[PDB]
Amino acid sequence: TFAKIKFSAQIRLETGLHIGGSDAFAAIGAINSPVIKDPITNLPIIPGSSLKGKMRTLLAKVYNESDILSRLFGNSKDKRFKMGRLIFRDAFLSNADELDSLGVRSYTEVKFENTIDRITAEANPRQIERAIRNSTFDFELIYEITDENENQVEEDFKVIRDGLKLLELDYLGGSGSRGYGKVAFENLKATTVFGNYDVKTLNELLT
Amino acid sequence: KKEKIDLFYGALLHNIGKVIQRATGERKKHALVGADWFDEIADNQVISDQIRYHMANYQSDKLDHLAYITYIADNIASGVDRTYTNQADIFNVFGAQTDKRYFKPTVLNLKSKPNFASATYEPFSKGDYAAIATRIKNELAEFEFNQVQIDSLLNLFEATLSFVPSSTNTKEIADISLADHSRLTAAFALAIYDYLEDKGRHNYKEDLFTKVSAFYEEEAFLLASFDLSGIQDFIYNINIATNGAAKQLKARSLYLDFMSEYIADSLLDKLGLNRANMLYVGGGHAYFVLANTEKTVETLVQFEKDFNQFLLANFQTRLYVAFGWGSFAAKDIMNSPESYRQVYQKASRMISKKKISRYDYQTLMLLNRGGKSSERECEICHSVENLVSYHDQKVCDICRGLYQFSKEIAHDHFIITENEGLPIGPNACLKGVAFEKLSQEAFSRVYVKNDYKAGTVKATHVFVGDYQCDEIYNYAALSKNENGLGIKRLAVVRLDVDDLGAAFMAGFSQQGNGQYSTLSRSATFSRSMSLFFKVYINQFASDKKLSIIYAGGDDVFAIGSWQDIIAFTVELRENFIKWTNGKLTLSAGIGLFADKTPISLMAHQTGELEEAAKGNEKDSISLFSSDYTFKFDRFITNVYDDKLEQIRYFFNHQDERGKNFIYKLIELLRNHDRMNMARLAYYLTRLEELTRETDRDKFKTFKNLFYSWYTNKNDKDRKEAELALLLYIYEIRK
Amino acid sequence: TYKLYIMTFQNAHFGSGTLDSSKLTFSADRIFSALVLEALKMGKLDAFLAEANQDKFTLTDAFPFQFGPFLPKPIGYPKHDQSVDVKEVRRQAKLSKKLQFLALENVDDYLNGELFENEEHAVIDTVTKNQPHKDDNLYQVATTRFSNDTSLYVIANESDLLNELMSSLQYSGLGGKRSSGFGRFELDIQNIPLELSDRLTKNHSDKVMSLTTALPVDADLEEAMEDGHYLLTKSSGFAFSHATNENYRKQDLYKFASGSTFSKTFEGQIVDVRPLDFPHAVLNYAKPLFFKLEV
Numbered sequence A: 001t002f003a004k005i006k007f008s009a010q011i012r013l014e015t016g017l018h019i020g021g022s023d024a025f026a027a028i029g030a031i032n033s034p035v036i037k038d039p040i041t042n043l044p045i046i047p048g049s050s051l052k053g054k055m056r057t058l059l060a061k062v063y064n065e066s067d068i069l070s071r072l073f074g075n076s077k078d079k080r081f082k083m084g085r086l087i088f089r090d091a092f093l094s095n096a097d098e099l100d101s102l103g104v105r106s107y108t109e110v111k112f113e114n115t116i117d118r119i120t121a122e123a124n125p126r127q128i129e130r131a132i133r134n135s136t137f138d139f140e141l142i143y144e145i146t147d148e149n150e151n152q153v154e155e156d157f158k159v160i161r162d163g164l165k166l167l168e169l170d171y172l173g174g175s176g177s178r179g180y181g182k183v184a185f186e187n188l189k190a191t192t193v194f195g196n197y198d199v200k201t202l203n204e205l206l207t
Numbered sequence B: 001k002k003e004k005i006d007l008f009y010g011a012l013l014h015n016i017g018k019v020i021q022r023a024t025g026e027r028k029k030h031a032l033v034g035a036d037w038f039d040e041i042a043d044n045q046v047i048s049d050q051i052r053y054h055m056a057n058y059q060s061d062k063l064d065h066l067a068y069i070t071y072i073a074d075n076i077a078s079g080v081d082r083t084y085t086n087q088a089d090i091f092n093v094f095g096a097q098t099d100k101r102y103f104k105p106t107v108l109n110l111k112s113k114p115n116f117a118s119a120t121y122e123p124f125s126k127g128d129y130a131a132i133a134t135r136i137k138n139e140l141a142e143f144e145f146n147q148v149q150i151d152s153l154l155n156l157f158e159a160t161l162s163f164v165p166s167s168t169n170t171k172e173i174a175d176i177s178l179a180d181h182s183r184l185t186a187a188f189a190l191a192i193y194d195y196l197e198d199k200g201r202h203n204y205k206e207d208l209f210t211k212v213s214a215f216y217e218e219e220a221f222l223l224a225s226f227d228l229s230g231i232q233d234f235i236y237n238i239n240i241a242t243n244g245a246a247k248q249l250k251a252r253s254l255y256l257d258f259m260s261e262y263i264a265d266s267l268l269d270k271l272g273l274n275r276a277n278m279l280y281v282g283g284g285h286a287y288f289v290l291a292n293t294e295k296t297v298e299t300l301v302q303f304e305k306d307f308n309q310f311l312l313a314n315f316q317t318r319l320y321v322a323f324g325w326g327s328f329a330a331k332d333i334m335n336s337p338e339s340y341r342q343v344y345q346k347a348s349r350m351i352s353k354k355k356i357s358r359y360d361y362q363t364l365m366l367l368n369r370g371g372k373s374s375e376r377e378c379e380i381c382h383s384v385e386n387l388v389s390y391h392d393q394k395v396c397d398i399c400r401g402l403y404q405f406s407k408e409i410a411h412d413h414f415i416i417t418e419n420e421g422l423p424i425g426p427n428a429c430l431k432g433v434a435f436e437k438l439s440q441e442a443f444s445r446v447y448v449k450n451d452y453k454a455g456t457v458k459a460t461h462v463f464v465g466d467y468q469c470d471e472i473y474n475y476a477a478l479s480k481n482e483n484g485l486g487i488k489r490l491a492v493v494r495l496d497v498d499d500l501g502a503a504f505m506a507g508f509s510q511q512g513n514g515q516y517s518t519l520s521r522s523a524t525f526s527r528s529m530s531l532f533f534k535v536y537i538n539q540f541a542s543d544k545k546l547s548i549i550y551a552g553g554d555d556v557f558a559i560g561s562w563q564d565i566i567a568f569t570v571e572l573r574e575n576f577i578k579w580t581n582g583k584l585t586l587s588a589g590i591g592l593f594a595d596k597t598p599i600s601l602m603a604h605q606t607g608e609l610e611e612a613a614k615g616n617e618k619d620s621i622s623l624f625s626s627d628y629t630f631k632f633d634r635f636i637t638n639v640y641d642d643k644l645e646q647i648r649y650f651f652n653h654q655d656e657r658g659k660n661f662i663y664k665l666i667e668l669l670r671n672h673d674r675m676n677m678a679r680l681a682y683y684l685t686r687l688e689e690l691t692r693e694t695d696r697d698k699f700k701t702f703k704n705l706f707y708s709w710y711t712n713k714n715d716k717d718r719k720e721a722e723l724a725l726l727l728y729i730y731e732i733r734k
Numbered sequence C: 001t002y003k004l005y006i007m008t009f010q011n012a013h014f015g016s017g018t019l020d021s022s023k024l025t026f027s028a029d030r031i032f033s034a035l036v037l038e039a040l041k042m043g044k045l046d047a048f049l050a051e052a053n054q055d056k057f058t059l060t061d062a063f064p065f066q067f068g069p070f071l072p073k074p075i076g077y078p079k080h081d082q083s084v085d086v087k088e089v090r091r092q093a094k095l096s097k098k099l100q101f102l103a104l105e106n107v108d109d110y111l112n113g114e115l116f117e118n119e120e121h122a123v124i125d126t127v128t129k130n131q132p133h134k135d136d137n138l139y140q141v142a143t144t145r146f147s148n149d150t151s152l153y154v155i156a157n158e159s160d161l162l163n164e165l166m167s168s169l170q171y172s173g174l175g176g177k178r179s180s181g182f183g184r185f186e187l188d189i190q191n192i193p194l195e196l197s198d199r200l201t202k203n204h205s206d207k208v209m210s211l212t213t214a215l216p217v218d219a220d221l222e223e224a225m226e227d228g229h230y231l232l233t234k235s236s237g238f239a240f241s242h243a244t245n246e247n248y249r250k251q252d253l254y255k256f257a258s259g260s261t262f263s264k265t266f267e268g269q270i271v272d273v274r275p276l277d278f279p280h281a282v283l284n285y286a287k288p289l290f291f292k293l294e295v
């Protein structure tokens, strides 16, 4: 049989995000490290590769000798495990219409910061563009229940879900050893789209 | 052949009495001064009797003879039907009307400063010829009249006769130089020889002298061209994480220029021709003058198929050369407006038709024939055949030859062998060679790069603009001063002369009434632009810490230290607008980059600034970012010389105000609502009464000068100040 | 020939032979390889290839969709017929090169000569990415970021054996890095205007315009080039497979691009570009749906 169940969630930023992009130009007063944005709407995005790589680098810390990361994220080698069953997606800032109701001028703050020499004791300033707190972003994560993997779907659900508690407990972004992380998932529901699969045995394991 | 030689030289060494007689002021006619001088150096009656009778006005019917071809080609190669004025500037008859400018007659050198025209050279310069003419009489004193040195005499003229007029006793034709008038005469005369020797005619006086309007309106020439397609994609095929930094880009944009040189060369000896018949060669484009006959057109088609088989053998539809030829009578001569460009465009239409319908049946069935179990590929160009492991990366035959050519790029001499280095044609490969290795190697044709001396190898003289002050990675570290002041960045500039094709085809059509729109004006214009962008850019990049990765056509792509990039481009344009009398705007994009950044990530962001400065209006420099986009006349005068020197002059003759004040001015300049005008008026008035009474009129004459342009309400005075303060902060960075 | 399948991407990566580069539209042998790699997961490949080797169905590569279907620039058109004012007609050919897509409301105003300032949909951006703490880890992905109203619309025969595959490509993605977020869309099957399906021929011996990357059968490939004005597009790449444990290339097919105008319509073929000694075929769809120009 064949199905594609997705994990809808609102992500929530309990501190900021700095997912960096391309370094364009210093421009003396301007921002040194700008956050990645959506070039049509000029709005802060989470690229899905950042979600995907950070979830993989947490789950790979949990599961070492692997065989289960390879089927859930892919592997260039090992012919069984190419395009491994999970298709992540960018995160599009659902509450653009709500944060301005909370009273704000932009969706990205500019955090000023510096670096102090140990001997000379002279500062070195910075402007880091973070996304603001409690921006809520869209999220879905297609898991494909294809024909072969039917006996092992639920042991690939205790790994997708266990990789989300880790993103709640690790930072999910850049420069996150200094704050800038703490991203909590909410309304983590698993619906089915294009398939005949019953998800009333999973949505209680999620919440 | 055997008597195409003497017709060539006699249609090239004629009007050489216009050097000796024009120098010593002798009363003998120029059709006899050099004609009798010619017997001093060598004994060849065949060329001499053409020089004795090339005018065909001293002796009408005295000399079958080949000076009829020489006289009709001398009429055609001029701008009309052809006494104390020098050579006019090319841009006197160009576009709108300005002052009449004139060249000082000089020779050329790689170290010579340029030869900028001026209106103060109206009288005739005679004493400057004794250095020129004796420079003729040395290397011509021992010379051989054959194919061995059929190309070395052309540089001997174009080094020395490039700023020498032709027939000063005239009214209109002045800016056609003698090294171009003789060149185009020798270019036409061989084509007339082919058109006449194919059609069986032998006696010339009844078709070339008394039947002037018979040949004058007989469609008897071809303007060929070609267009090496896919140059830009092949060159900027470099990406992030590439083994070669810019040697794989210098040596790649140089290699296609030798390929464009060699298509032009080897096309002319499949015919019977030589370098005179080529009007121009540049970035894959090269316009010719050939004969309108069937044995030439079939040679064109067969050579086009040969070179496209070569490009398919090892470039796989990334490069495609497309010929195209327009048949024309003597119609590049002042039905005057709609005759010249209307046949120059006839070849471009055939190119655009052949660029769009590339191959045929067999050569595309052989393409997608299948039959290849490839595991790996060349990670540069994604080709498959002939994979090696050059520095443990899987690369191909061409992209290992390019590293070998990058090790050989610094030489002056580049020879064509059959089995060594990069292939540039059918059984023809390129190799870079030292001078004293020519006896070790075994070649067929030799190119020498950036040389006006004739040398020993008797070579073909190419002129590729290049310069390297240091390696690329030092260009950030050399961005400091001797005191260490200066930000440690390196800049990249990309230039382009705006609307050059429009300034070449139409070009001269505004002055007169379509009477200056000849082939000679466009040929001298091509020599002017080629001379500038292939000779004088190395003069402009002399002291500076940069590297010209490409120069030619109308592009200058150059990496280097950012002080010596901004100074380079200000100097380049302030010499180019003297060179073109203020016609032909050029429009650059400079971008700053930190050290240790990849070169495609660098060059693409420079090229986006270049195209963001193409569309300002047309003529703009785009400093470092999409917003700092200034017209050059609004940049070099206002920003770089007026405001930046006023800011530097204020901020070095004091000690109280520092970089915190400059930073707070940059913020008030960048945000700038109407409220920051009041906040700036408060800030500068606070600091006026905080400075000491020694330096208070010094500060008052600075704040009444900064607040004045801040509140100017024209928007072309506040944006300039922000770029000036960015440059002053970048100058004094620790 | 039948109903056309608007697909709103909002994020994509479309090839161009590298990973630093990206097309605007996605070249219908890609959508055919997507349908085959989707029907392989379903176990529906046999009936799909049986459907896919018939005269019944077509495919057609993507085109932008702003409130109406768009067409390629007819390559070689307009032929000349106004040779004045060099200063601006030389400047316009730098801009009229980068148009490449026309609306149906004016595609016959193009063959008569019109300037057609290029609208701006889908800025093709680029971003540098990494793999932390590793050796060489700076690749650069060229995003194709659609302008919130533009979709892509393959044109096909509406069959449920294919509509299930197209409804599953909503969620499997369609593009370069599908697993990292790109290419995933929302499908919307709509009907065809009467000035488009009137012109979608396949057998009309007339001045015609190809609407997919096609490759003629060799009896028709002779004089497909005697009047055709085309590109070649070099459909190469590695053959995707779950039976290698390796990486082999396809057989490097050259196909006439979309917008290639012709006279005397031809017949395309499914060109097996399988590697040598390789278990399953690699199909590389080239059979064209056409477009009548002056009919």
Ligand SMILES: Nc1ncnc2c1ncn2[C@@H]1O[C@H](COP(=O)(O)OP(=O)(O)NP(=O)(O)O)[C@@H](O)[C@H]1O
Pocket (backbone or CB within 6 Å): B227, B228, B229, B230, B231, B232, B233, B235, B252, B253, B254, B255, B256, B257, B282, B283, B284, B285, B550, B553, B554, B555
């Ligand atoms: N050898 C070279 N090295 C560097 N830049 C070059 C070289 N040759 C040409 N160029 C540049 O490329 C420009 C022309 O680009 P290009 O678009 O390839 O013209 P083209 O020859 O007609 N190819 P195409 O656009 O496909 O028809 C010239 O104006 C130069 O600025």
Ligand SMILES: Nc1ncnc2c1ncn2[C@@H]1O[C@H](COP(=O)(O)OP(=O)(O)NP(=O)(O)O)[C@@H](O)[C@H]1O
Pocket (backbone or CB within 6 Å): B280, B282, B283, B285, B496, B497, B498, B499, B500, B501, B502, B504, B525, B526, B527, B529, B530, B553, B554, B614, C090, C091, C094
């Ligand atoms: N001396 C020359 N004589 C004739 N053509 C030349 C000469 N130098 C370069 N060219 C060609 O002129 C063309 C101008 O190219 P390009 O600069 O892209 O167009 P343009 O006229 O400058 N319009 P723009 O790019 O907006 O400035 C190129 O094909 C060059 O190869």
Ligand SMILES: [Mg+2]
Pocket (backbone or CB within 6 Å): B496, B497, B498, B499, B500, B554
């Ligand atoms: Mg230009």
Ligand SMILES: [Mg+2]
Pocket (backbone or CB within 6 Å): B495, B496, B497, B554, B555
């Ligand atoms: Mg240019």
Ligand SMILES: [Zn+2]
Pocket (backbone or CB within 6 Å): B378, B379, B380, B381, B382, B383, B395, B396, B397, B398, B399, B400
């Ligand atoms: Zn290569």
